[PDB]
Amino acid sequence: AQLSEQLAELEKRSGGRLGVAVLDTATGRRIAYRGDERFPMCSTFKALLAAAVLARVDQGKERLDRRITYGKEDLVDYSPVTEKHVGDGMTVAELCEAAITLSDNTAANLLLEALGGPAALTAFLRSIGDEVTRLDRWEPELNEAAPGDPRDTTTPAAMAATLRTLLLGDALSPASRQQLVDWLVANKTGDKRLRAGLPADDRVGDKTGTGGHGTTNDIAVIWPPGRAPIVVTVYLTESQVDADARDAVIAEVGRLVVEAFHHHH
Ligand SMILES: O=[N+]([O-])c1ccc2nn[nH]c2c1
């Protein structure tokens, strides 16, 4: 209730459309602002993509140490890791790490190819119970973020529930689960979004995303000391303020989420 008004005030000053979901795993209870509205995912999809790959590894259809070869012509804009390994190539695990930790666009496209494309990612999501999130396009076309376009979107609540089952539930094997946590925890943003609003003593594994039509997102599983973990998803789009302002918007969601856990009662 109170956090809602605070977020709606924050949404006004952003000029855009803000969506937040908070899933407390101690109770399975969730708080949500536009939690059942569609928002463009941009790079936050890469957390799901590495999950779907690890699920192939669990099934035996993939190996984290499989070498993937690619040439200069497979590269798209923003490939900080993969661009320096056109010769060697990279293992699946190295592409997953590059995609989560640095948002390497070629890594994600290479992992989508190994998977079977946006439809295979969407198909995996369905198999774990997410009936909402959808990936339709490849990098970088999927960062369009056009209002009313349902392609490449999720909801704050759907994304939060999906992170819960992948990182904390029984969707992946325990080892794949631990591996996906390890990748998300070693973000190198790093960091100015949710991370910036939170207590430093927290262990945070997060994924950021940026797009057109004034879009910045951040999703995260947070482990507070001596406390069950909490899943926070934040989606901002149609924002009229600039990229640095959008970062501070997301950090302010983080601060408000903490205040409401400690004080609203
Ligand atoms: O992100 N959080 O929802 C959250 C809530 C309460 C907390 N106490 N410590 N860290 C926290 C994070």
User: What secondary structure does DSSP assign to 48-107, as a single string?
Assistant: HHHHHHHHHHHHTS--TT-EE---GGG--S--TTGGGGTTT-EEHHHHHHHHHHH--HHH
Supply the residue whose CA is at minimum distance from atom 4 of ligand 1.
258
Nearest-CA residue for atom 2 of ligand 1: 258
Domain ranges of the chain: 1-265
Record the resolution, in angstroms. 2.3
Kindly report the backbone phi and psi dihedral angles of residue 119, in degrees, each rounded to the nearest multiple of 5, phi listed first: -70, -35
Pairing of strands 153-154, 230-237: unpaired
Q: What is the spatial distance between Cα 69 and Cα 128, in angstroms, rounded to a whole number? A: 30
Q: What are the pocket residues of ligand 1 if the criterion is a CB atom closer than 6 Å to any ligand atom?
A: 22, 198-199, 202, 222, 224, 230, 232, 257-258, 261
Distance CA 66, CA 81 (A): 17
User: Closest ligand 1 atom, CA of 254?
Assistant: 1
CA neighbours within 13 Å on the CB side: how many for 142?
A: 26
Provide DSSP, 4-52. HHHHHHHHHHHTSEEEEEEEETTTTEEEEESTTS-EE-GGGHHHHHHHH
Look up residue 163 and give its two tokens. 């992170």
Distance 46 CA to ligand 1 centre (A): 24
Among the listed residues 162, 49, 166, 59, the one whose alpha carbon sits nearest the alpha carbon of residue 98? 49
From residue 224, give the alpha-carbon distance in Å to each of 25, 28, 250.
Answer: 12, 16, 19
DSSP secondary structure code for residue 261 in this structure: I
Our answer to whether residue 176 is catalytic in this structure is no
State which of 227, 231, 234, 256 you would mutate to test the pocket of ligand 1, scoring each by most atoms of that ligand within 8 A of its C-beta: 227
CA end-to-end distance (rounded Å), the chain: 11
Residues 6+ apart with CB under 8 A from 73: none
215-223 and 203-211 strand pairing: antiparallel
How distant, in Å, are the alpha carbons of 54, 92, 101, 138, 175 from that of 41? 20, 23, 16, 12, 26
CATH class of residue range 1-265? alpha beta
Way the structure was solved = X-ray
